[model samples]
Target: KIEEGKLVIWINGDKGYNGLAEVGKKFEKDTGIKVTVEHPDKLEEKFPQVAATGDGPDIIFWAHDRFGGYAQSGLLAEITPDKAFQDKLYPFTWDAVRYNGKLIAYPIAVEALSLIYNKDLLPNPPKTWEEIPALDKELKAKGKSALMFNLQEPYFTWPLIAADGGYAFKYENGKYDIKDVGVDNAGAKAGLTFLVDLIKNKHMNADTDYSIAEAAFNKGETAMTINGPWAWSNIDTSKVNYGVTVLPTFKGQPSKPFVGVLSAGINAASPNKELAKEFLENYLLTDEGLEAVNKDKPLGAVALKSYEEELAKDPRIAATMENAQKGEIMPNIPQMSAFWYAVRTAVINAASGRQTVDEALAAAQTNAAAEFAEAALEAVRRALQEFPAAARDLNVPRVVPYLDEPPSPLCFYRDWVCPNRPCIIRNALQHWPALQKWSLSYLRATVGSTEVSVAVTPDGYADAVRGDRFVMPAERRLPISHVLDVLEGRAQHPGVLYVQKCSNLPTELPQLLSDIESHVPWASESLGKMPDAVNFWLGDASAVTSLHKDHYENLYCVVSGEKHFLLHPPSDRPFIPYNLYTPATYQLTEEGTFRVVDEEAMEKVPWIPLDPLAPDLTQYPSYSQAQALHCTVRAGEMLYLPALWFHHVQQSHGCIAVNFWYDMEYDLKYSYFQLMDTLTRATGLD
Candidate 1:
């Protein structure tokens, strides 16, 4: 497949490509083949597109972190160099170049985070974290801080947080267990507590970032900072007397930072794959080539054993090499894409006092799980061409289908529940005597004096958005007879009232249970479990249930007046918008107007902002793509509403309904929905 006597290699940095250029002449002289060394912008982004079409460079150089994604995409070629050549390089570097036990790149250099301190402030760097606080007073007296670094970044904080055995993923037997994340373990908590203490003691600024830390260290105001070797160029230019060493010990254990390897890979579709491998094994992986690159920017550590002895002549290089020996290789799995954002959020939230260290790390662990699931699922769905196709499907019900009789257990579960479809069964509620015996005058005679919980709102919008706030109804307890008085226009109240409780009907109304079954038999059998909760609904026409979706399957039955529902399936998630609002409750004062009282202790609520009945298309133009279906459950009828089906409800005067809620399965379907939700948020669809 050799095309011509020429080979091209693309690297992202001048320090790498320029050195390769020097080695390219020697490679040409040894093999009689010309070499073109090129530096390209965004090689990672552009190479995948070009290489898939067989037009990318023969060799592409980048950090080892990207190898997993490229190799999985079938863009990187597997190389089996001679045993002697492989043995000439550091064995540990082989781990960076291998993917799924196959060699995909040649590691030439290494980098890792370490402690960089100003020798002028302290002749010797602190060997333990405990020593840091002791220096704080002395340093502050001299107008300097004991230490400062990118406090909000995990790349710099990893060593401190991981000194007690915390880690991102579980790597065992040469493979990473993506499911076993340890970011919120006890060890991580202990480490993070130390970080929070640093801020509490005023030893480091919570707002410190890489640039700020670098600048402060350069200005000689910071005694120490944690950073990688790539930051040395600016430090070398400054007059600050700096020393590099392993991060200070924490809790009697040496801190372990993340070691990153920079390596070169060959494109799988390259015609000169063999020649490219030869060039790397014989020329670019040599002492002369790496030394040339080191002159431009310190490689900090070399992967080739032959070049290590020569590179260690620099004290900085020697110090970093020692740290690299103790550090864990940065994870190269695709799931690692989620670790950065989650860790950063955790650190920032803890540092800013928005959340406690435990809460922040626990939420970070949960956030990481969701993000990792989305990434893995989306990649699989993309490989199968099932991504946007599932979310954007225009297939929706024109009308909820009607059935005279309830379907068999298996049939219902397969046709409707599995596909998440809604249906109305006319004769399903005929077995219940409540449909016949439940009259206004009859209900007044039986259990009418019992106290009931009611939601009272100013404009009949309970738990709905008003202006810029998410306003919830004022909760009140009143006799059922009193509620009937307001519904029948026999009495007056300041706000609309509804007795809608997601409660256990068995305990709430045991007297009324005799007329109706506690659970729908066929539906319960179909779901393979009994109802988790049975809710009772009784309200006037003005009292509306706002648009929302639940994670439970609902079987809604109407005992009296009809219930009007405007429904949208889960697939319309992109069009149905959500926004964070200050959550407040509507409270009526003696002046007869509702006051919006904010919930001070609660976080901002994320809720649906657009009303399907009167959607503001100007504000949410994407809703035009969403199709809605209308279904009304009248007296003596039951509607099977599938899980995650968004619905907004309105009812006739004195409508009374009871619904059974069954838990939904958390399987592949839920994962797909979660992926869509993440995509919607990430792409600014809401």
Candidate 2:
């Protein structure tokens, strides 16, 4: 029933055409599937006629685009492999063959265009297009043609046009529209003008034929050429060194060239269709097939896994791969034939000086638009008829709501409130026994007219002193009136007192004042008690706090204010000069740091010594090495202030906070010192 001698095949007569011929010979020797290859000079002429007469070869090695056009005309056959076969093939390769929801071909190799230059002549390729022109000028001045290009072909121009953000057609509504082409757009025009000027100005050897250009480039008459990997086998690079890089960007965007794929297909009409499918399933859809294709062709592989690794190894291939990502795939639609013909005609007409670039482009666009419209309408009609009614509806809805989770109570301590207006009396009763039961032993009394609320940063200092202190683990909501009663000294051992008064105090009250106020309503009386310290901490938002060291260790907690603090550690003081005054000495190095010599200070010390400004290089060249941490505290968390740490705080938004201060028991300090001593001893250090 089956008359099968050697399975005949047709292939291109190009340089890499032997890849198929060799595979055929190997197949025949190994499996007795004798393959007689009919090398054709004109594939276009032989393929259609052979397909029409039902006398086409059993298999073919040809371009994927040509296969697509033939498949569209129903000349070529659909080739759908089994699920196992599909799984073995590369995803991109399989995707390439898929046309209008059907697999029409099988991919063999991927071809990409890249830059090839004489390495000895130019060591490094220019990173950008602007650099390319300058480099060309330099080469020309040195008695050499900088580059060779084929303007007669669209391949040379398309990449540059794309780099300048030009497009031949706009893909919208799931189809290409030539009417929306941006070839004449500003960026496109700029790119075209630049390219044309390069040729016209003799910067490039554009008019030379492919042979002449290739010969000139090979003989070192030209420095570089934009070509495909096929040129590698033809060019004899034994005498001269060569290198390659990706096409540079026009501005910052890279030039990308169109890619072509070599692939195979099965004859759907053949009686041996099942056999052909089996052959492809076993040989072409396997990892072995991928390795064979790559090893034989050496241009590039369609298999994604090995393809990426190969490109990384070769610079020329890498450039090609990069360009391929940016390049648009050729349309597989039947109307693409008309578009290609129009483009060829337009380019030829422009070369012959029969029409301007704009004129040729406009004519091409008008004709392409008509063809595209007809094809798009046909596609739409076919789609609507094939799809289900339910599938026709394309609408999805979603609802998003804020996340609701319980607040984290990782850092929680004792809460407090103050009592009635017995400012001095409450101050004396602060160290009482009943108040200490509620973790209110650490307290500071204020003597202002109003009360305020304060929060403090927990740096384990409080816990270290009072082991396992009372900590409120859950949210506790209380009335403002009750908070006021505690602040006014009416309620004893209240939780936290709310106050509103400014009292001047020493600059070193951050620790003591912040601790007391933060534990208010329970720790001590109102902020009205410490009028002096309150004024110092709650200066007018516009006022600046002078840069100085605090006498008592403190945490400058911010509740409802924006402060900008510039601090210099004790070690950095050498790099930061200080302005000496009768009352205090302030750091004079930074712009925002506080200065003791204000108008009042200036008047007081008319002839006070002012140290020279710190030299940037000599003193603070490694200023950045000095660690500095920054954080913006809103109305919630307290900013931790370690003892002896230098800081300069400025109100950026507004001023609203209470200063807390409390003396730690001697036992707490002794235990902390002992712990440090033990750590040092364990580490074998002083």
Candidate 3:
């Protein structure tokens, strides 16, 4: 069976008839078995899906950064290469494949960004970025640009970003401190501020992508570019007179780029993994095989130390090696996926002048934290994405369970709070006098003259996505009796009124605090935190609250009319959708119509536009898989709404309720949801 087995390999990019294919053919010639090499599109995305089912190629040829994730998932095999073969390779290359003290892959090549400049334009390249502006002015006089690269790409911009002391994660004693992220520290901010200024001064174009910038330099339209060996082939095709050098210094400090290693690994699930190892050890690791691979396509600076002497004759290889020695190896952990996503966006936002350096980096720090948390919860991420229905079955409840009486503090904390499940408790609020005495007639006699904040909207919806804008209701300060008059049909208002001044009961309705407890005793004891807010809610039958989640543990007590709620567990994050919309306010015009006024300088808000009552399945079909729990909390009932549970609400005419909000603990549960939310956005599930 081993003799008759055929080896399969997956390679990225176009290496037709050469490079790894050449090595594969040699392996087939040595062993009387056939070899198949394939270049597949979306290799990174497709390999994980197929490999998990034991149906992918036997060997995966890709970057070293992905080895940590593959090894952690048990998708790649730990290999002990021939001792001499390992010693002949650069020592730094081993770090890329080593995870938990085991070697998971073979390191092939090393590369990093270098300053490639036009030999004809400048005999000697500038030693520092500070000289770029003056050089650019001179080039502009002759109808040319001084420099260009992928302005928004984190890979290209990283040299400048790390020139001071910035790093994605702390690497100490040969291990990554995944929690100590330093991307937004003072050193990083200083570096980014300079880059932003460079873009602002027009020394580089913000709109230039990788292809655009590379093509400009290849065509001799730009004088300089910061790129790696992968860009050499295109420039060779164009026949531009160029020279490669280490990247220029930043304020007299060496600017170091991320060093990447391209490598190959064996699939643990493959039956022919031993045969695969034989091919690598017997043929691919030899100098002759390495030379043949480099013949078809450049391997940048080969990792084999003995082979480095021959390749060093090539100037490009020399510069890449020098830069690699000065640079830190790119982190191979799975969390790096999120770090790349965040820093790329931050670079673009700052380069485009859409946000300041402080603002962009601050946002990047927050986004990376959420994204890293999400990547850490890979099992839940897979379950939520691949099997939405199964996730719902395992995590969500069919209904919010009813409790005839409130449970003890320890019981509530263990059963409800720890599991983050929702429940409705009856007789919990029976001690409050407001339950029976808070009629409209009685409220008119109590605090009728007190001024309160009311949210007025033309339609029933307030603070919901309206067309392309998130429209907030216009606020009106009026007496509680006046709002009651409108509800009772004795007065008229421009739009529907909802007295939902969240967290305003203490300041606006101090008299009502005596009627009801400021916070639920059992809930307070269970959470061990005082209520952050006590809010009063009163609205017309037509008033509606859109689907959204809160960061607080909510205890909602209905005083008079019944309140209906539609809920979904936090595990359903993948099924729900969130979109960024321009934030605006619904302004009531003089002609009795409403106009949306855009809020100046405000960031776009992420909101859920799906209405659970009548979901448009045609547009958001994933929502069909979400399990919804609909229940009505009648008068004299208290509903305990757990944190992060998505809820949509409606009420009967003149419904009156009060809710206590306690800050949710940022423990593992919250981190899990945060990660789920990040993945939902990243994979376009939202």
Candidate 4:
């Protein structure tokens, strides 16, 4: 048995070394652990040799990428933390260290890549990748490079390619399949082509060393760069202001970086494994330990949830974490080594114009396929020899539904409207009762929305269930029984249903009306199905609804008191617009005003008109094509509005309303047809 208070450790160099060294020295002092640290000059050469001999350090601090080879060769330990300590690390960080269903390491550091720029140079960063090239050209005209990236580094470019809907490898059956590699995928090629064009056009400078790039950026000579947390300490901010934000997207797809965790793992052969485990539990896993690490290194913490809170005060940390959300941990399969070489070589060759992009990608794919075939066949042979019964089977998990009794697969579709006016809240709340309670529970548990509504499109039937809508007056109770009964063919309404809720009865009607108005994306075809009459409710005081929209028409019923609505109809153009990335829409320009073009005349925008009333004919000639209708939803009253109308609403002191969207057919065919079309186009022969 190993003696207590005696241990030796090895850690990687670079930004990681400094923080861990301090922790090691402190660990020895506090516990009388008598630790010796072997911080070698060339860690890459030293660590592997030491690890191979089975006489390595008691503890090792290293990145996830380096851990794979060592672990697969059985040179490292399976470092399983006790339940108490296991909960301390972030879920994603823990996930990074896991290999082939076994725990291999514990995370010590987390690094995320994001776009960082000189705040002085760019007050606001571009929100999308489509905007980047133009910005780069503009910056070039001013004799500055808009961004700095290591064209030779696959890690940097990989994320950019992924942002444009490209994947480096196809993952299936818990393994990376080289056959599905997407280096030549259209989107991936496009992204790479853009990079090449940038290089050729002199919009980017490739030969600049890291130091020169940083110096230039610090001096405001460069606009931005794609880098990780390691750059934070070296960024020279004394001469200029700097800030970091999420990387821009291509179209609406955000760039995803490869996240690496600096994890800790015990040497399986070490005699002091138990002691080391205990030490990690008491110190690194505790609140104090986390605070200490965060205070010293501040590279960003491994605790994913707490990272956000820390980021509020620390801008650098925030930027890193922002990028982390878009990251996917690199696969740890041993065969991944072959992929690295192939991808790196191909990317470099293509970017340098040494080979056509197609040729380089094809070569890489061929190499990768051979390696993957060897690994896969070996894996299959091992399985067959070990268990004959499992032959010809791929170990892919089967997805199962949540409920025990499988209901007839149903698709429900519907559209509702409150004709003549907009009532977002009333429209949304009208459908609240039909929503699954779990959605409300989620809202309450996380965002604390005052009232939440969800719509469920039940199996293929397109009619309403003939029964009292189930209502839960208290928390923790769900209407699952009612919903399942309908889904299981026990109810009359077989199609889609809407659920809505409000702070209290007083504001319920107007709130539902408002929900219908602002949030729903309405199309002309949908609006053509407006109902002539609708239902609503008016409640006592103490009710308010936040602004939003709904997917259906609302018949708002105001049982008592007054209600007010600010309705924007579908005919209005250019004012309210949909965001391609998010479900929500935004009003780009102010209400009652049109966007200006040239000084001479204004052009009428399509979709939502900017100016609702008396549009400047000279400025907006197209406004003549835009028209809207408006009316109020009142107590003991119902109003009909077509689906997809936009509105804002508020109730007089106290009122109650019941509102909902109704439809004739549940359109399950939409998704089916879409998939069919996609398959036909892809396979060609289909």
By summed lDDT, the worst window of 10 consecutive residues in model 4 runs over: 579-588
Give the Cα error of residue 182 in candidate 4, in Å.
Answer: 2.1
Local accuracy of candidate 2 as per-residue lDDT tens digits, 1-686 = 46565566666654354555565566666676665667776765577667767877776666565665576556767886667657655677776677767888777667777777888788887767677677888998888877785666666676776677666676546756646765555565556656656665667644665567677778887778777666765554435577666776777877857666767766544555655555556654454544454454455545444444544567667766776776666555566556665565555555555676667666766777777777665554333323222221221111111112211222111111110000111132233232232111122232222233321112211101111121111112333333334444566321222222233234223434433342423222222222123422332333333344343223334544555655543333322333223332222222323223223333322110211222344533533333333434433333433333345555642244444443222345345444543443333221
In order, the Cα lDDT scores of the candidates are: 0.83, 0.50, 0.84, 0.54
Per-model RMSD to reference: 15.6, 25.2, 14.9, 26.8
Estimate, for each residue in 574-682, the C-alpha lDDT of model 4 and write its tens digit: 2233211111111113232212122123232112222343455665553344333345555334444334445445565424444545442224523443453343333
Q: Write down the worst ten-residue block by lDDT for model 3.
A: 12-21
Give the poorly placed runs of model 4, Cα more than 4 Å off: 1-10, 34-50, 140-143, 171-179, 236-239, 290-296, 304-315, 377-686
* Cα displacement (Å) at residue 345, model 3: 1.8
Clashes of each: 0, 64, 1, 76
1 or 3, greater by TM-score:
3
**Tens digit of per-residue lDDT, candidate 1, span 249-348:** 9999888887888888889998898899778887777888777766666676888888887767887887887887777787777666568679889999
TM-score of each: 0.50, 0.50, 0.53, 0.51
Per-residue alpha-carbon lDDT of candidate 3 for residues 1-686, written as tens digits (9 for 90 to 100): 45468899887773322676778878778777688888888786687789989999998877788777787678998888777878888887887888767898888788788999999987899989899889998999999999998875698898888888788898668767878998898878878898888878888878999878988999988999988876777777788899999889887888878888878899999989889888776676667777777776667887787787677888888888788777788888877767888899898998888998998899999989987886767745565666556755776679899988999999898878878888999988889999879999888898789888788899889999999999999877889999999999999988798895544465467777788887898889889988998898888999999999999899989999999999988887798999999999988876767889998899999999998999999999999988898889989998989999899999999999999899999999888788878878876677
Q: In model 2, what lDDT does residue 142 have?
A: 84
**Model 1 TM-score, all chains together:** 0.50
By lDDT, the best candidate is 3
